[PDB]
């Protein structure tokens with residue numbers, strides 16, 4: 370039993386909700402919140418920009434030190450950093466950005482990072498400003514993640530379409 374509330378159950382381990390991941394994180398304080406990161410951990414917009422804003426830019430400060438030490442992530446890769454005031458940890462995961470021409474096949478690799486954590490609060494990778502089809506992202510998530518994932522979908526019209534079209 371966990372403290373996530375109001376989710377629809379899609380499969381044995383995948384759950385979904387119309388919610389702002391920022392507000393969800395502040396309520397549950399999950400062990401892991403997933404950020405929709407880029408390889409430079411520049412949290413300027415989308416989910417990443419919103420999460421960072423909620424940390425009063427502390428996420429960006431920590432991220433800049435991480436990049437200065439380690440260099441950029443790989444597309445499809447991840448790193449674990451602090452969750453600041455939102456969660457114990459933030460798993461920064463880089464899904465491919467279609468608006469940069471990045472390979473969509475890398476979306477499965479991106480979701481594989483979730484399997485290193487027993488329970489996660491997450492957005493749909495590569496959706497939104499990353500340019501991929503959120504319906505497809507949900508399919509890859511369900512077919513790749515085996516650990517318990519609680520998906521927050523910000524757009525209500527999209528949440529309804531994701532539910533109604535889910536196979």
Ligand SMILES: CC(C)(O)[C@H]1N(c2ncnc3[nH]ccc23)CCC1(C)C
Pocket residue numbers: 388389390391405415416419492493494495496497498499503521522523524527
């Ligand atoms: C890009 C995507 C799939 O995560 C969705 N995004 C968010 N999902 C959850 N929590 C959020 N908080 C701030 C943004 C945000 C942004 C727009 C979207 C398409 C509905």
